[PDB]
Design an enzyme around this catalytic site. Structure first.
Site, PDB file in Angstrom:
ATOM      1  N   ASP A 134      44.885  32.335  32.348  1.00  0.00           N
ATOM      2  CA  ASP A 134      45.092  31.799  31.003  1.00  0.00           C
ATOM      3  C   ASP A 134      43.920  32.212  30.098  1.00  0.00           C
ATOM      4  O   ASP A 134      43.330  31.389  29.386  1.00  0.00           O
ATOM      5  CB  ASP A 134      45.278  30.271  31.046  1.00  0.00           C
ATOM      6  N   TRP A 136      47.083  24.281  34.236  1.00  0.00           N
ATOM      7  CA  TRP A 136      47.484  25.299  35.208  1.00  0.00           C
ATOM      8  C   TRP A 136      47.248  24.843  36.643  1.00  0.00           C
ATOM      9  O   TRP A 136      47.947  25.288  37.553  1.00  0.00           O
ATOM     10  CB  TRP A 136      46.792  26.635  34.918  1.00  0.00           C
ATOM     11  N   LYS A 157      48.100  35.913  30.967  1.00  0.00           N
ATOM     12  CA  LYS A 157      48.258  35.864  29.510  1.00  0.00           C
ATOM     13  C   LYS A 157      47.567  37.088  28.915  1.00  0.00           C
ATOM     14  O   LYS A 157      46.385  37.339  29.176  1.00  0.00           O
ATOM     15  CB  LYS A 157      47.685  34.577  28.895  1.00  0.00           C
ATOM     16  N   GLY A 193      43.240  21.540  32.143  1.00  0.00           N
ATOM     17  CA  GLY A 193      43.844  21.663  33.471  1.00  0.00           C
ATOM     18  C   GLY A 193      45.357  21.789  33.429  1.00  0.00           C
ATOM     19  O   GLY A 193      46.053  21.180  34.241  1.00  0.00           O
ATOM     20  N   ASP A 238      36.231  28.335  34.954  1.00  0.00           N
ATOM     21  CA  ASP A 238      36.227  28.265  33.487  1.00  0.00           C
ATOM     22  C   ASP A 238      34.813  28.174  32.906  1.00  0.00           C
ATOM     23  O   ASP A 238      33.941  27.509  33.476  1.00  0.00           O
ATOM     24  CB  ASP A 238      37.077  27.083  33.003  1.00  0.00           C
ATOM     25  N   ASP A 284      30.299  30.731  34.237  1.00  0.00           N
ATOM     26  CA  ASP A 284      30.618  32.080  33.730  1.00  0.00           C
ATOM     27  C   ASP A 284      31.715  32.823  34.514  1.00  0.00           C
ATOM     28  O   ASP A 284      32.018  32.478  35.659  1.00  0.00           O
ATOM     29  CB  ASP A 284      29.324  32.916  33.683  1.00  0.00           C
TER      30      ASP A 284
END
Lengths: 35, 93, 174, 202, 103, 317
Positions: D96, D37, D136, D35, D55, D71
RNA sequence: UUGACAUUAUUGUCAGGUGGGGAGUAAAGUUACCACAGGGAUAACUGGCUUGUGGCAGUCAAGCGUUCAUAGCGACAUUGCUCGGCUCUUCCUAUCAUACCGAAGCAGAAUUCGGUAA
């Protein structure tokens, strides 16, 4: 006179206070174990 | 998974399971330390053993959990078929 | 409860003249609410005039506290200044120091004031003169004896003391 | 006192890009396995922000932060944003995305470059008009292709790789502030089959 | 100096040490629920500690909350004839939990 | 059938038969779904923003900037802020230590909401244990005149001497007394405040000692004690306020109704200011009460408070 | 300093509270809450070390207790909740693989535990 007496009987002060503390340990613990 | 389940790792009877995991931590880890070593090596010794036995039991438990078919997630025939042959509540207990 | 002697006030006013400057004349001359201070069991208490005048009926064992406590007289004969004084002190501060929002809680646990906080302090500060710690909102945090002068404390390595902690408002958790 | 070292490189990106996360109310967070972010999306966005995390790992919930743990590429999890974020559209959308690195680097960068387009198609579906899209992305053969499709689907596309990164890692944090929100979107454009169509020989 | 013995700390920890300048007590060594057994009825109730009362060996340890063998502690009876105090019997520095017997 | 529910309280909650029977008679099964089903909420997190150091509109910004969900309660005062979700420590924030706000319950507001302190006057007290309410005395006052603080506990004065100086009241004569012999100490002509020396002690979510360990002997002598404390409160003056934190009748509207007859100088005015339900007349074979309508009530399930009663008195001669 | 009474704000009496402030018949105890300077006393020696099964309380209970179960100790069970890393040589087995075996619902394949084995 004070510091000379402390150097003469310092050892006995250590061991007497320690053994009296342990006597107080067993005294309190007996005062719980009786009840 | 699909139709049948023969491929399950065996289930040790909880007394032997202890004799597998605890003996493996005795054989696979170092076992000999002096009291005259540094405290850091004594700490690291016993830490390594607690952790390794931790991974030991967890590995054996994970094999059981992943091995057995997830009864209510397979198929309606098999969900009920296992429910008939075995007490489904106790199978989930 | 009793009234102070000639020397016993002077001991208090000097300690109060360590943090407040010569602006201690604000503290005793008001004319409306002149604010006299008394002590009970060797510990001074700052109050309004009449609120101590009518409380002269309370027994010495029955009494606990009276308004704002400054501090207690020590057995040796000095005067400590407790944190409870700050509500009277910071309103009439002379040498004032601020801190980081990040480096606030270290101070609030009993640590000293590091150099790692740089900005706008007071000027003309002597090395061993009493400073008052502020934290946006100018929130008073406590007391302090300065470590160095204003000049010396600017050209310093950030892990050196600028103000020795004396009492902080974190004492209100006890 | 955060969760990961990935926390210190968005609070650094806000100061460089006009504190865009300060003004933002709702945030869709992608690929956040720690966590690192959503914590910094809590200290930047106003109180009762209502920020949503997605996630692949199943893990714990955090106070003041809703997070769905499944998913990314399926339609059912897209029906879990359709389950929630139909009434409100996201102000920002974070990414991310990072694979399990250690296989050739050619594919460790191309499954990244693949992942960012799928995060884009979850972003282009659920973003407010003139928002942003922080990502990213690894520097690779197919980075210049991604910056182009960013350039024609957003207003201003600026790459960074800020300080408090690894300095050895081939990371880029590219922001895409300003969103077109078209009524006519090109379908052959957004699909990865046409994106990585290689340039002809000289 | 730090203590390497297991202690109980009361819920007013945030700025409690007035007289404990540098007496470090790590969070790992803080056990909150003593595994207490009932004498008259052989049932063990795992209940939270409320107050450390009387530790022998040291009167420092009474003020630190140290749980060495022989310490009389206060037990919370929220879950529930009962006695509010229990005397500890194990050495929690050696084994895992704190084991106490009611009085 | 009643005894079924008496088996579904003394076993379901693990409760005393003496209290389960005495707090169900002439109370509806709907009211049984109100009071008994509310002892799992356990005090909703309100706060008392000290008006001396800061206004509320300048304190809404302070906590929100640190990520605290805040919302005022209904109609009474903007002072009461309901905390929903905070990660910043709930007692160790620098603003607690400053004296900008004290952590209170919603029941802690109203016995001093009912009381109306004015400028230059003195307020007397008998049993204010934490000192959270004496804050609301000396803030509406704006630090003028005299404010007495009192409780009959040498150990609990430390909370008073902590909170008074913490929040900066300046006008506090905090002194330990026996509350019965109080008019012989001074007997100040201006108003007094009394609150909860109680054996009935409502809301068991706070103290679960009530759940198990309340017999009849508490109801014999503690209602007698607080009965005598009224007879000292009416011998101080001038607007008397006497309250308690108990829903049982033997604590409020049997104790106050004694002192109503016992002196002709007693008048019961409209107690609260905003809302709070109407008071009864008949209390299970009790007297005529058309005068005791104004002494307000509060429930743990009708509103998110902790059940208590307020009684505000007036003296003439 | 508060109440009662009278003057019908001001002034009197009585009654209630404080009162080493004055008249008459100060400072001291304590300290393992203890913080800083000084004096003592030693710390830190495989006495074959070390390994896999916790602790506390109870239930049994071989015997022994100075006779002996009611001077008490008591094993295995059981019941209660819960500084890191590069490279080489040699050695050890507490062996991951290779060799041969034993047990296992071990149909075959695959496997699990165990034995000999460096």
């Amino acid at each position: 006179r004070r510091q000379r007496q402390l150097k003469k009987f310092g050892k006995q002060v250590q061991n007497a206070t320690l053994q009296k503390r342990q006597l107080e340990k067993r005294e309190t613990l007996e005062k719980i174990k009786s009840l | 998974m699909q139709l049948s389940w023969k491929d399950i790792p065996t289930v040790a009877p909880a007394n032997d399971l202890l004799d597998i995991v605890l003996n493996r931590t005795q054989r696979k880890t170092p076992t000999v330390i002096r009291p005259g070593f540094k405290i850091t090596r004594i700490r690291a010794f016993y830490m390594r053993k607690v952790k390794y036995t931790g991974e030991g039991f967890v590995e054996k438990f994970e094999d059981i959990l992943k091995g057995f078919p997830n009864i209510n997630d397979v198929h309606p025939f098999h969900r009920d078929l296992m429910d008939t042959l075995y007490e489904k509540n106790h199978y989930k207990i | 409860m009793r009234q102070l002697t000639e020397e016993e006030t002077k001991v208090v006013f000097e300690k109060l003249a360590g943090y407040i400057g010569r602006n201690i004349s604000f503290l005793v001359d008001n004319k409306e609410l002149p604010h006299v201070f008394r002590l009970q069991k060797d510990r001074v208490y700052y109050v309004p005039d009449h609120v101590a005048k009518l409380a002269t009926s309370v027994a010495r064992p029955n009494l606990m506290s009276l308004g704002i406590c400054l501090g207690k007289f020590t057995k040796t004969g000095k005067f400590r200044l407790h944190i409870t004084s700050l509500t009277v002190l910071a309103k009439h501060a002379k040498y004032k120091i601020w801190i980081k929002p990040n480096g606030e809680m270290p101070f609030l646990y009993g640590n000293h004031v590091l150099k790692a906080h740089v900005g706008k302090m007071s000027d003309d500060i002597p090395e061993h003169a009493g400073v008052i710690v502020f934290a946006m909102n100018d929130v008073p945090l406590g007391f302090g004896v300065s470590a160095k002068s204003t000049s010396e404390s600017r050209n310093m390595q950030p892990t050196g003391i600028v103000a020795f902690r004396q009492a902080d408002i974190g004492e209100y958790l006890r | 006192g955060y969760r990961a070292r990935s926390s210190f490189k968005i609070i650094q990106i806000n100061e460089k890009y006009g504190h865009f996360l300060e003004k933002s109310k709702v945030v869709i967070d992608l690929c956040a396995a720690p966590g690192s972010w959503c914590q910094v999306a809590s200290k930047l966005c106003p109180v009762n922000s209502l920020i949503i995390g997605v996630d692949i790992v199943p893990m714990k919930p955090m106070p003041n932060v809703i997070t769905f743990q499944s998913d990314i590429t399926t339609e059912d999890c897209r029906s879990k944003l359709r389950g929630y974020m139909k009434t409100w559209k996201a102000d920002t959308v974070l990414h991310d995305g990072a694979p399990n690195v250690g296989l050739g680097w050619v594919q460790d960068a191309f499954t990244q470059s693949q992942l960012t387009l799928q995060a884009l198609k979850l972003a282009v579906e659920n973003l407010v008009v003139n928002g942003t899209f922080v990502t990213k992305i690894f520097r690779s053969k197919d980075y210049n292709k991604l910056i182009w499709v960013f350039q024609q689907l957003f207003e201003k596309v600026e790459a960074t790789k800020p300080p408090a990164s690894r300095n050895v890692s081939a990371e880029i944090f590219v922001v895409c502030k300003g969103f077109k929100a078209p009524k006519r979107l090109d379908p052959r454009l957004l699909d990865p089959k046409e994106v990585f169509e290689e340039l002809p020989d000289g | 100096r730090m203590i390497t013995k297991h202690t109980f700390v009361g819920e007013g920890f945030t700025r409690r040490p007035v007289k404990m300048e540098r007496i470090i007590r790590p969070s790992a060594l803080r056990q909150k629920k003593a595994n207490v057994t009932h004498p008259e009825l052989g049932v063990t109730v795992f209940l939270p500690i409320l107050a450390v009362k009387k530790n022998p060996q040291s009167p420092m340890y009474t003020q630190l909350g140290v749980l060495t063998k022989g310490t009389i502690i206060e037990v919370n009876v929220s879950e529930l004839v009962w006695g509010k105090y229990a005397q500890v019997t194990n050495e929690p520095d050696r084994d895992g939990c704190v084991n106490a017997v009611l009085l | 059938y009643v005894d079924r529910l008496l088996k579904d309280i003394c076993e379901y909650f693990g409760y005393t038969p003496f209290l389960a029977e005495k707090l169900f008679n002439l109370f509806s099964p709907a009211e049984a779904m109100e009071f008994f089903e509310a002892n799992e909420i356990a005090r909703p997190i309100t706060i008392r923003t000290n008006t001396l150091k800061t206004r509320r509109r300048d304190l809404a910004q302070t906590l929100v900037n640190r990520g605290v969900n805040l919302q005022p309660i209904g109609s009474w005062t903007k002072v009461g802020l309901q905390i929903f979700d905070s990660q910043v420590p709930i007692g160790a924030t620098p603003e607690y230590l400053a004296g900008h706000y004290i952590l209170q319950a919603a029941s802690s507001f109203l016995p001093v909401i009912a009381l109306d302190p004015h400028e230059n006057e003195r307020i007397l007290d008998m049993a204010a244990a934490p000192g959270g309410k004496t804050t609301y005395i000396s803030a509406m006052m704006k630090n003028t005149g005299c404010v007495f603080a009192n409780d009959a506990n040498k150990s609990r004065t430390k909370s008073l001497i902590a909170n008074i100086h913490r929040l900066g009241c300046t006008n506090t004569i905090v002194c330990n007394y026996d509350a019965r012999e109080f008019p012989k100490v001074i007997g100040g002509f201006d108003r007094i405040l009394l609150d909860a020396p109680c054996s009935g002690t409502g809301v068991i979510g706070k103290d679960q000692s009530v759940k198990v360990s309340r017999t009849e002997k508490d109801f014999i002598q503690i209602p007698h004690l607080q009965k005598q404390l009224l007879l000292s409160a009416i011998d101080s003056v001038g607007v008397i306020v006497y309250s308690t934190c108990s829903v049982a009748v033997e604590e409020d509207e049997a104790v106050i109704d004694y002192a109503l007859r016992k002196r002709p100088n007693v008048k019961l005015v409209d107690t609260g200011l905003a809302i709070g339900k109407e008071a009864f007349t008949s209390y299970r074979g009790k007297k005529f009460h058309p005068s005791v309508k104004l002494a307000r009530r509060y429930y743990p399930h009708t509103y998110n408070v902790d059940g208590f009663f307020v009684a505000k008195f007036q003296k003439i001669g």
